[PDB]
Amino acid sequence: ISEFQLKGTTYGVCSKAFKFLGTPADTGHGTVVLELQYTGTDGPCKVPISSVASLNDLTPVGRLVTVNPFVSVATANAKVLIELEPPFGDSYIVVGRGEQQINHHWHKSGSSIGK
Numbered sequence: 001i002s003e004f005q006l007k008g009t010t011y012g013v014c015s016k017a018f019k020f021l022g023t024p025a026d027t028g029h030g031t032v033v034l035e036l037q038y039t040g041t042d043g044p045c046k047v048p049i050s051s052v053a054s055l056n057d058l059t060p061v062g063r064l065v066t067v068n069p070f071v072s073v074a075t076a077n078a079k080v081l082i083e084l085e086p087p088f089g090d091s092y093i094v095v096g097r098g099e100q101q102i103n104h105h106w107h108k109s110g111s112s113i114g115k
Helices: none
Strands: 019-026 032-037 049-052 079-085 089-097 100-108
Touching: 019 079, 019 100, 032 089, 049 079
Parallel strands: none
Antiparallel strands: 019 032, 032 079, 049 089, 089 100
16 A cells, blocks of 8 residues: 655655665565665765566655655664555565666465465
8 A cells, every 4th residue: 555755756766775684574564574774975865766567666655664765864874673564465675776776576365476
């Protein structure tokens, strides 16, 4: 399920220095827990993370549960666990902007993969 203000264009879409620490894992509460580390000393920017049902990142079907995805400071250099909402059947969790990205899958109660 999806709203505007939680995705919320609070700044321009950049991020540069992230790396995965923990790929998304379903909480059994309807959500996934996902962990990154922030691999640089810079980049106050609108962090591109998203939650969709078919890697249709072009129209967000889920949300970012933990926070509005925006890096408000250069001090964001943390190792940081974030919740997302992956919809039922399938989901795809995208981390990045055009030329610079990563993505991960999930499969939950009626997937194309049968779970």
